[PDB]
Write a protein that binds this DNA or RNA. Structure first.
Lengths: 101, 101
RNA sequence: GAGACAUUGCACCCGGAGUCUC
RNA sequence: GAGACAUUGCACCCGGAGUCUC
């Protein structure tokens, strides 16, 4: 009982604000998760599972681990955003090996 | 007048068959473009611009140049498929730099 | 088609992109 | 909604994914 998130490639924030215009979350999420690293991409939808969250992509665990240990429960526009690692992280990293490496 | 395709990252076949079930093109396209290299992905739709073609992705020009100089106008199921380089190639290669390289 | 109310959630999946007609 | 007929074409873009109602 009681599972665990654990660090895995990147992370995903949750409990986001419920009064943002979606694009406002990218300007804030894609502006704070890159200052101390380099954001590769973010995932924000309007489905039940994607309600009040936004998966962020970095490149290595040590990059997202540094971004997750900086805004741990931080106030965005009017609520504390909780950060949680992404056990699945960017699914393109499963075939990205063909990038050039 | 008279432009040129030129080699660029990967390629795209055209004049494909007009009696395939779509999945049959992937079994043939994704089976011959990998034997002499390593296919990264293929693009086949049903739009006017995507009529009788299938963009293939490799990794480097020398990989697609080798695949394009092997099946130049080859018969698939009942027609000669013409191969043409993809000046745009996979658009993810524009931000894939964050893969790990 | 759209809006309000719900959920505290590991998503990057999926479907369309040429006209014509029943 | 689907099928036939068209186009010989550098696409990987885009839109949905919680219910309730007008």
């Amino acid at each position: 009982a009681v599972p665990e998130t654990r660090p895995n490639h990147t992370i995903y924030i949750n409990n986001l604000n419920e009064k943002i215009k979606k694009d406002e979350l990218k300007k804030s999420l894609h502006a704070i998760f890159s200052r101390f690293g380099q954001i590769l991409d973010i995932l924000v939808s309007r489905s039940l599972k994607m309600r009040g969250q936004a998966f962020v992509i970095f490149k290595e665990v040590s990059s997202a681990t540094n971004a997750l240990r900086s805004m741990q429960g931080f106030p965005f526009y009017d609520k504390p955003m909780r950060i949680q690692y992404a056990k699945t992280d960017s699914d393109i990293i499963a075939k990205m090996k063909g990038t050039f490496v």
